[PDB]
């Protein structure tokens, strides 16, 4: 609540202005997107653990109720990063050359973890994935750099 730097509060207020209402705040079904707008990347499990909902109008979250949630997510530390994702996709890099089969990555994103849907992968690939070889390979380091907003790795 009151232990968040003032500049960070203003970013939250700006998200609540765009996403929520002055009186009610944000709808709990948008808790995940509200945290993402603040450059956080919580899992679905973490969202649910913090009060996220799946139907709209079941719960509202006021600013002063959102701040300690935001603070806990920001302080939570094992939430992944570019470097972790590089090591993960080396499991599909037989030649140790920074490439993998595009079909292997698509299957992994659609079948493991908190799987995405076809449309999300399609958009994700169109925006961040380079064209594939005739053999079906792609470089996964540029894809991850764009997805994670890590231009320093390009």
């Amino acid at each position: 609540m009151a232990d968040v730097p003032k500049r960070e509060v203003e970013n939250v207020e700006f998200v609540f202005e765009v996403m929520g209402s002055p009186g009610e705040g944000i709808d709990a079904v948008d808790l995940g997107d509200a945290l993402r707008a603040l450059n956080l990347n919580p899992t679905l499990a973490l969202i649910e653990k913090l009060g996220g909902t799946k139907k709209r109008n079941e719960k509202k979250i006021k600013l002063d109720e959102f701040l300690p949630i935001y603070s806990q997510v920001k302080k939570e530390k094992e939430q992944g990063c570019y470097e972790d994702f590089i090591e993960c996709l080396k499991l599909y890099d037989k030649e140790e050359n920074g490439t993998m089969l595009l079909a292997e990555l698509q299957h992994a994103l659609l079948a493991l973890g908190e799987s995405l849907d076809d449309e999300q992968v399609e958009t994700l690939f169109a925006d961040c994935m380079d064209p594939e070889d005739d053999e079906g390979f792609i470089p996964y380091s540029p894809f991850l750099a764009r997805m994670c907003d890590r231009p320093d790795q390009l």
């Binding site: 998200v15 202005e17 765009v18 996403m19 995940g32 997107d33 993402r36 707008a37 450059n39 956080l40 990347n41 919580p42 899992t43 679905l44 499990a45 973490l46 939430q79 992944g80 972790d84 994702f85 090591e87 993960c88 080396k90 499991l91 037989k94 079909a103 292997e104 299957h107 992994a108 994103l109 079948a111 493991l112 973890g113 908190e114 799987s115 995405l116 999300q120 958009t123 994700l124 925006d127 961040c128 997805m147 994670c148 907003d149």
Partner: protein, 786 residues
């Protein structure tokens, strides 16, 4: 024509493989339980109350079963695995499951260590084409999917590389496709060993496969018979030697036969026939034969071959004999030789009808008619009055002189049976010799690859003398396998620099083999009982128990019987299970008194073929003149031949008794895997460190368990050491070799748990960042429109 792509029948696709390996799976709850109907069922543990496990099944049933019957499951990485020796869980339900899943995917071939398993699909898959065969030329077994062609090519390369003869032991019960697989192995060797000379004679003589098959009508007419479980069962072991020249090209072939079931010549169980030839000749489908043979139209005139069934619904004996007679012509038998074969075959039938009787209390026997003997004499070209004289009052070698001896009814009757079996056995040997003359090319023979077809281990409700004999044989054959596996494992461990202390795996079967063959063993006691005229079935049974029960570990009390019939006398702990044996009649069956005086008459008769087939007899191991001693002699001859080769092992499986494609009868397949040694192989390999991974593969797979720890380490062996040490694995659960790491059973299943947990977590992070990217993208759209 165009050869269909064999890929769908040999490979698991990349797409299918990633589906299998990402399937949901709970290591803690998944299990196999036994089931009366399906053999085993896949279940999920719902609860455990002490030693009682509550297992949920497909459909909602919950079954309480003792924990000892709950068995572990392989994780998805090992789904439809090509070599089951690579499975982390090595038990019977896991073997059945992997075989079943491959079979359901139209994949009939699977390795189990050395074994190549071939499950009959009852479909025509394009796996025998030239297109397919070319996949396997010069390829190592692990470079290509499982295939009998991979085993065949490997024996071929090993022959050329090691300069040592090879053997291929193919097992399979009726319906398993053993015949088809044998033909295609021969054809495969005819391919890789083809030459300008073989292609030359291939239009006149035919291919090697055709030349061998052309001998089937003769050898199967005289060597096959209808049994309870097979309308066309081979009653002899066959060793087909395929010879190669100094340059690895075909050099002809020859056939060796072993252990013909002589007893079947004069004795049949109620639902079985004698050898096909007797009913073929009696069909009358070839003009003149029955007249030459002095045969009637009534099979029951010939007791020795009419004790059980005499016809078989699935066999037209008339059409078969026409094909058998044609095969004699095609195979180069002269008209005289062919007709003498018929004469001798019919003379055996007539000899069985020679009757004798006893007058008063005079022990000596005499003729009870002479019509049957007269026909024998005409066919054998000998004097009738002399034949009876030599049967009723033979002469024995007493040192220098010949003394006349007397014979009672039973003694003469037993000598007839021995003569009927002896003549037939020697006739069959001659027929093989004549068949081999057609396979001889006179080319230079350097090495051979021999294909062995001999009956497998059998367990029936009633197990008699014939069961013990063939189970005795397969114990030795399985020991042969165990020893070979032992040698290769020893070489592997040495090559990898890992300590090896295991005793020869063949020793595990020695106590059972010794119980049967050594002095005071089963066969020895049987032979020695014939030195006691007071001996009966009970005296014999009592001496077995008194000598071995509680003293020879493999000798056990017999299972309690179903009513009084099933009552047996002792059991043996074979590799394939506990077998209870009924010794009724063994003393009688084992007698084999050949009348040397009569044989001497045969050798001077007018039938030239009769002379020839007795050529190596000069009439004028244990017990002399017994069936058991002759059986041991030929078995030892067979094993000596095999022990001079480097063997390979193919196991053909009948998946169900209805010939239905895509159906696997679990209990039927389990019984075969027990009898054909596959499960014995599993039992041995899981004792040490069965699973092995090359270091690059291990690093590739489990690098995610400690990326920081191996950062910058180029050597994959060092990486593997670091990764394993960073896990909670016990120090003694693995061994580090020169090029690969070894693992005890179940350990890689634990590594897969570590990998799954870490991969699932990081992927959820990666997907959370993906949702954050797409979300922040949509937030910028709202920020502008707002």
């Amino acid at each position: 024509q165009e050869d269909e792509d064999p890929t769908p029948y040999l490979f698991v696709s990349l797409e299918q493989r990633r589906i299998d390996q990402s399937k949901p799976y709970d290591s803690k709850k998944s299990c196999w339980i036994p089931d009366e109907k399906e053999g085993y069922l896949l279940g999920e543990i719902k609860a455990t109350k002490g030693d009682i496990v509550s297992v949920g099944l497909q459909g909602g049933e919950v079954r309480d079963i003792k924990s000892e019957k709950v068995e572990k499951v392989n994780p998805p990485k090992f789904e439809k695995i090509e070599d089951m020796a690579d499975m982390t869980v090595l038990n019977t339900p896991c073997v059945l499951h992997n075989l079943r899943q491959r079979y359901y995917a139209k994949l009939i071939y699977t390795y189990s260590g050395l074994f190549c398993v071939a499950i009959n699909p009852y479909k025509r898959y394009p796996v025998y084409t030239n297109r397919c065969a070319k996949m396997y030329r010069g390829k190592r077994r692990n470079e290509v999917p499982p295939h009998i062609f991979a085993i065949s090519d490997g024996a071929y390369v090993d022959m050329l590389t090691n300069h040592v003869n090879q053997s291929m032991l193919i097992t399979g019960e009726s319906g398993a496709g053993k015949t088809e697989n044998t033909k295609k192995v021969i054809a495969y060797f005819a391919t890789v060993g083809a030459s300008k000379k073989t292609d030359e004679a291939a239009k006149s003589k035919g291919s090697l496969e055709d030349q061998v098959v052309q001998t089937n009508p003769v050898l199967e007419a005289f060597g096959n018979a209808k049994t309870v479980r097979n309308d066309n069962s081979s009653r002899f072991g066959k060793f087909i030697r395929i010879h190669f020249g100094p340059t690895g090209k075909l050099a002809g072939a020859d056939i060796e036969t072993y252990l013909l079931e002589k007893a079947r010549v004069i004795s049949q169980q109620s639902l079985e026939r004698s050898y096909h030839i007797f009913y073929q000749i009696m069909s009358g489908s070839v003009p003149g034969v029955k007249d030459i043979c002095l045969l009637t139209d009534n099979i029951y005139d010939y007791h020795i071959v009419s004790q059980g069934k005499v016809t078989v619904a699935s066999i037209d004996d008339a059409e078969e004999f026409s094909l058998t007679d044609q095969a004699f012509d095609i195979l180069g038998f002269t008209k005289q030789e062919k007709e003498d074969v018929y004469r001798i075959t019919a003379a055996v039938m007539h000899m069985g009808g020679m009757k004798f009787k006893q007058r008063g209390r005079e022990e000596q026997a005499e003729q009870d008619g002479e019509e049957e003997g007269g026909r024998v004499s005409k066919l054998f070209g000998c004097d009738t009055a002399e034949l009876y004289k030599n049967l009723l009052k033979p002469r024995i070698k007493v040192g220098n002189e010949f003394v006349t001896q007397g014979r009672n009814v039973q003694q003469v009757t037993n000598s007839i049976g021995a003569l009927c079996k002896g003549v037939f056995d020697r006739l069959f040997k001659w027929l093989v010799k004549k068949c081999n003359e057609t396979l001889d090319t006179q080319q230079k023979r350097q090495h051979f690859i021999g294909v062995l077809d001999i009956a497998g281990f059998e367990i029936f409700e009633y197990n008699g003398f014939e069961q013990l004999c063939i189970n005795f044989t397969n114990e030795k054959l399985q020991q042969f396998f165990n020893h070979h596996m032992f040698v290769l494992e020893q070489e592997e461990y040495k090559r990898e620099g890992i300590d090896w202390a295991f005793i020869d795996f063949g020793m595990d079967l020695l106590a059972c083999i010794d119980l049967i063959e050594k002095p005071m063993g089963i066969l020895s006691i049987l032979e020695e009982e014939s030195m006691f005229p007071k001996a009966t079935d009970q005296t014999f049974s009592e001496k077995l128990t008194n000598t071995h029960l509680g003293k020879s570990a493999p000798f056990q009390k017999p299972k309690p019987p179903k009513p009084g019939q099933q009552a047996a006398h002792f059991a043996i702990a074979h590799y394939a299970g506990c077998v209870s044996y009924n010794i009724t009649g063994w003393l009688e069956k084992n007698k084999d008194p050949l009348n040397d005086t009569v044989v001497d008459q045969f050798k001077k008769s007018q039938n030239k073929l009769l002379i020839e087939i007795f050529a190596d007899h000069a009439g004028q191991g244990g017990g002399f003149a017994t069936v058991s001693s002759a059986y041991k002699e030929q078995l030892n001859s067979l094993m000596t031949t095999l022990r001079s080769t480097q063997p390979h092992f193919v196991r053909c499986i009948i998946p169900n008794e209805m010939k239905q494609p895509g159906v696997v009868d679990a209990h039927l397949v389990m019984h075969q895997l027990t009898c054909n040694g596959v499960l014995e192989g599993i039992r041995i390999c899981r004792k040490g460190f069965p699973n092995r991974m090359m270091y690059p593969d291990f690093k590739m797979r489990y690098q995610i368990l400690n990326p920081k720890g191996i950062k910058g380490i180029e050597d994959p062996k060092k990486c593997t050491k670091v990764l394993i040490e960073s896990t909670e694995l016990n120090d003694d659960q693995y061994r580090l070799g020169n090029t690969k790491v070894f693992f005890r059973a179940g350990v890689l299943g634990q590594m897969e748990e570590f990998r799954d947990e870490r991969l699932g977590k990081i992927m959820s992070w990666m997907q959370a960042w993906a949702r954050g990217y797409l979300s922040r993208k949509g937030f910028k759209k709202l920020q502008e429109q707002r």
